[PDB]
Each structure stands twice: as structure tokens, then as C-alpha cells.
Amino acid sequence: NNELSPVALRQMSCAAGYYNTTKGGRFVLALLQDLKWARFTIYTELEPPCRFVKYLYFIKGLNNLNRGMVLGSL
Amino acid sequence: SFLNRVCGVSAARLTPCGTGTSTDVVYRAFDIYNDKVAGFAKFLKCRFQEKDNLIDSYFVVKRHTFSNYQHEETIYNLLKDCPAVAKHDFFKVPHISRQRLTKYTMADLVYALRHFDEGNCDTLKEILVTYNCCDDDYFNKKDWYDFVENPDILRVYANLGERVRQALLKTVQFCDAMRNAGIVGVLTLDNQDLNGNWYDFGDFIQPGSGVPVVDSYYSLLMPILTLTRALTAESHVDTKPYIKWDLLKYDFTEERLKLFDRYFKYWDQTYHPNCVNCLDDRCILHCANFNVLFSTVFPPTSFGPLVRKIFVDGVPFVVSTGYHFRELGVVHNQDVNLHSFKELLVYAADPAMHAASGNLLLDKRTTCFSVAALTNNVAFQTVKPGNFNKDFYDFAVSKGFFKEGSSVELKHFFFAQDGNAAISDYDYYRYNLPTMCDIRQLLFVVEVVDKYFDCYDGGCINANQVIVNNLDKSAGFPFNKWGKARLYYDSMQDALFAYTKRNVIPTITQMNLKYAISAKNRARTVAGVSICSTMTNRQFHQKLLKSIAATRGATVVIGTSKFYGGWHNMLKTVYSDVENPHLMGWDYPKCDRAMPNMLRIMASLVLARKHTTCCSLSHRFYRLANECAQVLSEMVMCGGSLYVKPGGTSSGDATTAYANSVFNICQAVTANVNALLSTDGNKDKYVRNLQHRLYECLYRNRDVDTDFVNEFYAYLRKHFSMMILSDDAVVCFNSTYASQGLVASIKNFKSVLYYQNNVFMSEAKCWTETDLTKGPHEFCSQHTMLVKQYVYLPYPDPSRILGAGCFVDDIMIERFVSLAIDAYPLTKHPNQEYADVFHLYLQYIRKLEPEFYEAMYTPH
Amino acid sequence: KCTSVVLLSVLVQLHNDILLAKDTTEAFEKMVSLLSV
Amino acid sequence: AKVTSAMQTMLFTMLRKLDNDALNNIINNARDGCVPLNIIPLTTAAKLMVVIPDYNTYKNTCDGTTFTYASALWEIQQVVDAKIVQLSEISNSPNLAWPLIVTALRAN
Amino acid sequence: TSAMQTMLFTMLRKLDNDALNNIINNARCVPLNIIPLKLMVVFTYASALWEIQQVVDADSKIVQPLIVTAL
Ligand SMILES: [Mn+2]
Ligand SMILES: [Zn+2]
Ligand SMILES: [Zn+2]
């Protein structure tokens, strides 16, 4: 009964050019057009869109578990 | 009609195994994590069996909810193409029927081999016999399960390698199918029968962008890969002859990557076949964990130093210009020149020319790989017997000692050894086998152990800061020929250490036979590591070593003299605060000849985490490579011919005690982790939340979480105390917690050693004292007695004292004074004969004041 | 015992004492006498 | 200074046994001049030594006057025990010391 | 180099075991090999009874310093 991601986190608004609230510093997983760079101040480059007409963005260097949290919540 | 329906059109020769249509609960293993509990334990779950005589093939039926029914039906319909999915069957209340599944899942096998208990190990026997690995009568040969004895258990286990390999291949096929089908989910061991098929898609999610989370699966399954030799079929051409690997090939990097892609395709973390490309020590451990598994396919002649012919003044030598580790991959030097004191020192220690200019050798006495003889005739060494002391024995018998039935009786003697004893002793290295470790669990345990070791500070130092003691000690094979460490330290050094950070310097060490009193006739050996290794290891580690050796009240008590009440202070410290205090100890069977390579590498890395400022990443990696090539897989000259040492601790280096302490603390921490995770969380709240977050940090997080590391460190320091000295530990653990399984019991240590060290710890060699008023039964070969002065005192075994007194080797009273000093605490023993022991020594010494021998136990 | 016999295989009175011992500390002086010679 | 002179003399006198001719070919056959140290004597050795525990092993390893090991052909030229031993003696096994040193040479 | 032997002899005569004493006195009949548990002696010996099977004389001629063999 190993669940993917219970109590999934919610939407958040960010500046651009899904959050994982960790008490040791906030970390944004995915920002749900092509936006190569996103800013929050810190810059977070984004991956090519994931069409499904909305689009989803992954930060390059993201493991296969976080993609589950991001895609599972969506 | 239900039995007919459950098997529609596929050889419905079934037999009921439950109770009619009712479900069938079983006590199996599982991996559970859903927002209330997290761990790897056993839980209580309509199984059928197919008759061929019966064969292991079952139709596991389930009852579920319509939501889960449809959720699984969609994904199964989308994944039926792959052959690595157990043929399912859906019909209706909803019933999902599997088909042709094995009796036990991979999770059960891994749990049985990771939580071994000879008292209750029926599942392991059933698994072994069911697949023709051995025969049921094999278990009437009691002591069969042990590894040190009956090494045929390795052959028995290796019969599951093909099944494990097929399971891995089918898992990779399943991952490819999911990824192409756009399904995201988490992959667990408990959802794969032993044949290789899969099932239980009840918590997945919905093309071309799917991603399965397969970290827990491989991390938990890793240990069973080197145990059952799953990758032994990769040495064949494609029941076929062995691959005729070119003798000159030494790269194998492409083969490593091909194996990784064949079996670990979806391990979403960078793998560097050469560990020199790693980013941090955690990455080094992660990559070495895979190199260990992948090094058991290539020919064993490829590994070892890599030599290149260089020229000096037109004189061509053959010297090493790299090395090929089984763990750190290929490593190429940087300061290498093909044309042209320290140069002589580095060159001579190199086994390149020594093995090149020596006669080939084929030793059929042992099984360890040989390299080359260094002479025309092998050498046989013998150990002389003791030296009876007539005077002391006559004096003792005059005082009415050694009477029939007396409690004190000689049991320690100098035993003599015949000619072919050194080689028989060396052949004990056959107990060191390849071992794959749970990488995520080890990566948490390394952080916890570093937190243990956080109280100390140190770093690299120069040649004018290192303190050298015992300058008269064996240097090394080429070096002992002309002197000892004193000569070399009196000649040169800083540049050599600097060079040591840019190259690899393999060395040779001699294995002699020691001459000491013991209660068993087994031969014992002392090894001298090459000077070119100790010289640099001291500069690397001495600051930290001395920091740990002069710290009081810590978890490791190395260097804490028991005189002047030190024992009392240590005992009070270990008894800091525990609700239900108890005591416990243990002994490691063949610690120096069985601890795997990964644990030693981890200990070395932990001992080097003080260099975040003094050294960069590359310097630390080359230091690790030097250490691994010099004291882990070194070359040993036992007698007159060279052998390759598969592994195990080097008993001559100065960092063996502290490395063993790190290894012991790691074993204790992993025992606690297994006990807490294996504890059924569903059965208090703080502990349950702590274990939930422990599982999250182990098999869900991908980076350090210092907050939980501190929390768990404090939790252990509070409810599970310990006092650690290399391969010798005492514990003071909350008894109620251990009874509930919230801390490390002794069976936990047994299982951890079984599945992570390839040895068996006898429960008769580990004790437990429940009455704190009488402290630990045995620690550092000492006993404790609560006397009035009320303090604890260290008193030894009278038999050992008498034996040491009777038989003294050649080449004075200081030995008797030391024996009396160690014998004074016996005076307060309730027994009268024990008390007489000290007086005998004092009377004998005068023949050659109790206040002097009492002053060494009053704390001032 | 095995040392007193095996060590002779490569190198008569001292056989009987070592095997027929009940307390131990007698034979452990026999082996030195043979080895010295 | 004494260690320095002794060290190099050991290096020089230990190079004359390297068999440069037989070693040069195997080194040059490498892709980049790097070969594992293990296979150096295995393919460029002019002598082999076989330590045997008893006669049962002798039957399966060194039977006859020629035995093949390392994918080559060797011919026995001397046998020793823990004193020379004649090949006719081995058969009578309890009368011989266990560690027999069956030296040999490479047959061209 | 006589201290060890004199100590050994004193210890032996202190042990006072007939089996050891028998063979010790005989030496002052000596065996040629290790006493088993077939024996060659230059029949009761070492407090044990031996059945004789074959005998030899000085010139290596069987007879119905001689040599005695027994099991
Ligand atoms: Mn399941
Ligand atoms: Zn790496
Ligand atoms: Zn450093």
C-alpha cells in the first residue's frame, strides 16, 4: 500500500519569464507557451511544455518521484 | 462454481487452499506507506493452487471497491502487451483474479533473507527446496545456515541467481511498458511473484510521459543480488563456454554501462563507471554500490594495478599508471612522465615490477587468487611453544593452588603451530564475499553516524605536526629488508603526501605469525602495512584520531583509561538516563575477515568529512582511492609468494580501531532502523510519527534532511545508549521499548549481521544483564564488580591472570606489577579463592603494599 | 598434541605423555624439548 | 643514504629478469600501452611453481612429464618436498611430505 | 644447555606414572617410530600388551641387537 503522494500540496502563483513547502527553504517543483526561465529572488529554468490547452513545466534536474507528485496532483 | 470461474480457459486443475469462497489470511511481508504508517514489516492479509502432484502456481483472488476495480482494470488493459505482467482476470461485488502466481513474492524472499531467525525460518527453507536449490534432507545437517561453517550454503543460495536475473529483466520490461504507456506510479517488491510477473496496480495514475518510482524496489532488493549471484550468467557467450575475454582488456566501461541499462535502466540518478566523476562522497557510495555488483562478471585478472612501460635513460621499466578497482572503477594517474628519493619510494612499493620479474605460481593449497612467486622455493613458518616458569608454578602450588576442583584452573597457553600454518590462516579470507548494500538506508546511516562523530574536529596537517609513536615497527615488504619505520621517518614527506592527492600508490604488506597467549589453538597473524601507506594515512587522519582519543563522555570511549575511577565514570555516562535500564553486548564473528568492502569504504568516507575546508573533492577522492588500493584490496606476501587480498580490515594500520568503531555504530544504527521500520506501526504517537518520517527520509527523500537527522540522533541518545570501542560494545537500552520493538534488540543484530556481513552471530556469545547494580558481564575482556569505597571496579578472569603468570616468553618484574594492578580489584570479589590471587602475586613480587595498587582506583 | 607429531614429520618418548594427559600443563613443556634438539 | 643505494640496486638487478623481448611484444600489443599487472607473469614467465597438498591433486594436475597450464605447455624438470624427489616415488604417498613443489618451464 | 633436560627429567619422575616409568626405565628396549594406539622395538610394554607377529635379527634374517614387531 505504498502510496504515491498523499496530502498533495496545492496551487501557488509565481513570476515567470506547484510548490513543495519545505521548512528548510521553499522549493517549487513545477509551474503549471514556452517559458525558458522563471524567477521567484532566484531563477529556476524550466523544461519544454508537457501538452495535455494548458501546459506544465518541470525544472531540469528533477527526479522521478517529484514528477509523480507533480503529475499525480494534476 | 467459484473455483470453476476463477480459472476460465487455462487448465483449471486447481485445488482449494482456503475455506470455500472465504478469503485466506496469511502472515506475509509487505512495504506499506500511506499517511499513517511507514516501514518494511509483516502484516496479516482467496488463494488457490494448481495440481500438475502439486506445483507452485496460485490464483490470488481479491475483493476490492468499484473505484479501485475500474482503476486497476484500465491500467491493466493498457499494460497487457508486456510479457512481464501476470495474466489478470476481472469479473464480479468486484473480484480481481490473478493467474499462475508463485506461492511467495519477492518481498517475502527479501524479508526472509534480511530478517533471518533460525528459530523461525520455515519460509526460507520452503523457498529453497521448492526451486531445487537443495534437498529437504539438507536441513537435518544442523549448522547448515552458518556461513563460516558449511560454506556450501553459498552454492545452495546461488541456485536462485537465474530467478533473480529473470525478475530483474522482467521488471525492466515492465518499466519500459509503463513509460511508453504513460502510467505514473510507485514500484514495490511485494507486487512481483518469484517468477517475475507483476500485479496490484491499485495506486497508479494515467501517453509517452509515464514515470515509475522504482527507488524503494531496487534499494531493498540490492542485498539479495550478491548473495544469490544473479549476474553469474553474464560471463557466458550469450550452457555455453565462458567468454574468452581478452587478457589485455581492462576498461569494461562500455560493458558496465550496458549492464546498467539492461538491469538498472530507470535508476534516475547519474551513474559514473569511474567514480572519479562523482560530485560528492554520497555519489561515490552510490556508484560503488553498483560497481560492486558489476565487478563480478569480468575476468579477475583485469583488476589490479595497470602497468605501462616507461623509459629512464633508455632503461625500460614496468610501473603502474592507474588502477582498476572493483568499486571505484578505473582510475588514471595525473603526474605521470614517460621520460626522465620519493621516486624510489613510490617505485619500489609498486607491485608492478615485483610481479613482472617473478616466477609464475599456482598455489593449490588455497583458493585465493595468486599472482607470482618471488623466489624458487616457498617458505614454511612455525610457532614455538610456550616457556614454562618453574619458579612461579612451584610458588603457587606451595600456596595451595590448582587443587582438584578448584575454581581457578589453567586455561590459557602458548600454542605451537606446524609448518603450513600461515597459509591455512591466510585462507580464512575466503569468508569475504561481494556484498551489495541497501544504498538509501546506508546513505541515511552514514549521516546519522557522522552526527555521532560531530563532536570531534580535525583535518590535514603537515610533517611537523604529526606525532609518531613506536618508531620501531615493521614497514613493508621491500622496506623491512633494510629497517623499520624509524629509518624511513628519520630520512625524509610533505611532497609525497601532496603527490598522494594526485595519484595512486599500490603497496605490498607481509603477513607474519604472532606469538601470544590465547585460550584457543587457532593461529593468529599480525600484518605490517607498507610505510608509503601509513606515512600518508597519519597525515590524513591523526588530528581526528587524537580528537576522538582525548574526548570524554562521548559514545566512543577509545583511550579512556580505566584507572582512577575511569570505569565508574564511563559506566555512569552510559547510564545517562533510561526509563527501564538494562545492558547488552555482542561479538562479531571474524570481524576482520568478513566485513564487506562497502562498509569499509563508508567508514573511510565518514572519517574524511572533516576536510570540507582543507581539501577539495578530487583530493579527497584520490585519498579514498589510495586507502582502498592500500588497505582493502592490497597485495599480501604470505610466505614467499604474492596473493591478492579480497578484502577485510588490515590489522596493522593505525585506523583499524576507529574504522571498526564506525562500522559497529553503523551496524547498531541500521539494527535500530530495521527494528523500528519492521515494527508494526499500527500497533503511542510520537514514535509512530518518527518512524513515518524515518521512512520518508530514507526511501522518499533524495537529499539530506538535517532536522530529522538531529531528531533521530537525540532519540537514540535518549532511549538507546551505547559505549563503543572497536569491535566491542556495551548498551544501556530502555527495556520496555525493546520489548515493544522500538529500539535494537539482539535478534536485530543477528539478522543485520546475517544479511549484511555474511557471517552468523551465535546467541551464546552475546550476553544481557538486567540488574544494573552488577554492570556489564564482559567488556574489553574485563568484568565489573560493585564494591564499597559504592563504585564499579574492573576485575579480569583469574584463569587468564594465572596463565599469563605461569607461561612467560623469553626476555622484568613490570609484568608482575601490571598483573597485580589489574588483579587488585579481585580482592573485593565475594569468592575467597579469587581474592587469594592478588595476594599470591604480592607475596611473589616481594620474593623478587596494597595501598599502591589501591590508589589506582580512587578517582582523583 | 598435533604439533609434537606433525612437527616431527618434517624435522619417541614424548608421544605417550602428551596424548595420555588429563591435566594439561605437562605436555606444553615436552614440545620445547624436542624443538630445541 | 644507505637505503637509497640499496633500493636502486634492487631495482636494477631485478630488471635483468624481465625478459624484455617477450615483454615488449605483449606490452606493444596493447591498445594504449596499459595492461593489467596480473597477466604479466601469466604470459611472460620462464618458470612455474606448483605447490600440491597430496597425491590426489598430483594425479589431476601434474600427471606425466608434461602438464598444460595457462593455455601453454610445461615440462617438469624438478620436484622438491619440505630434498629432491624422483617422479617414480610419487604413487607410497604416505611416505612423502605434503607440500610438493613441482617446478617447470615453458615449452616453445 | 642441560638445565631444560634436567628440569624435564625431574618433572617426569615427579609425575610418577607407571606407563611412562616403564618405557623410561627400558631406555636406560627402545622404539623406532611413534608408539601407536604396529610398533617396532629394538610382550608387555608401556603398561600394554602387544601380540607379536614378526621378528628380525641383526643381519635382517627372520627368526622363528634384534628387532621386534607387534600390533
Ligand atoms: Mn500488493
Ligand atoms: Zn558518482
Ligand atoms: Zn584534507
Residue numbers in the entry:
A (entry chain G): 1 to 17, 31 to 45, 49 to 56, 64 to 75, 85 to 106
B (entry chain A): 6 to 50, 54 to 60, 64 to 103, 111 to 224, 227 to 258, 262 to 363, 368 to 519, 524 to 714, ...
C (entry chain C): 7 to 17, 33 to 58
D (entry chain B): 81 to 162, 165 to 173, 176 to 192
E (entry chain D): 84 to 111, 114 to 122, 127 to 131, 147 to 168, 183 to 189
Task: Reproduce text from the manuscript describing this model.
We show that the kinase-like nidovirus RdRp-associated nucleotidyltransferase (NiRAN) domain5 of nsp12 transfers the RNA to the amino terminus of nsp9, forming a covalent RNA–protein intermediate (a process termed RNAylation). The nsp146 and nsp167 methyltransferases then add methyl groups to form functional cap structures.
Our cryo-EM analysis was hindered by the preferred orientation of the complex and sample heterogeneity, yielding final maps with high levels of anisotropy, with distal portions of nsp9 missing and weak density for the N-lobe of the NiRAN domain. The first four residues of nsp9 extend into the NiRAN active site, forming electrostatic and hydrophobic contacts in and around a groove near the kinase-like active site. Asn1 of nsp9 is positioned inside the active site, primed for transfer of 5′-pppRNA onto its N terminus. Asn2 of nsp9 is in a negatively charged cleft around the NiRAN active site, and contacts Arg733, which extends from the polymerase domain and positions the N terminus of nsp9. Leu4 and the C-terminal helix of nsp9 form hydrophobic interactions with a β-sheet (β9–β8–β10) in the N-lobe of the NiRAN domain.
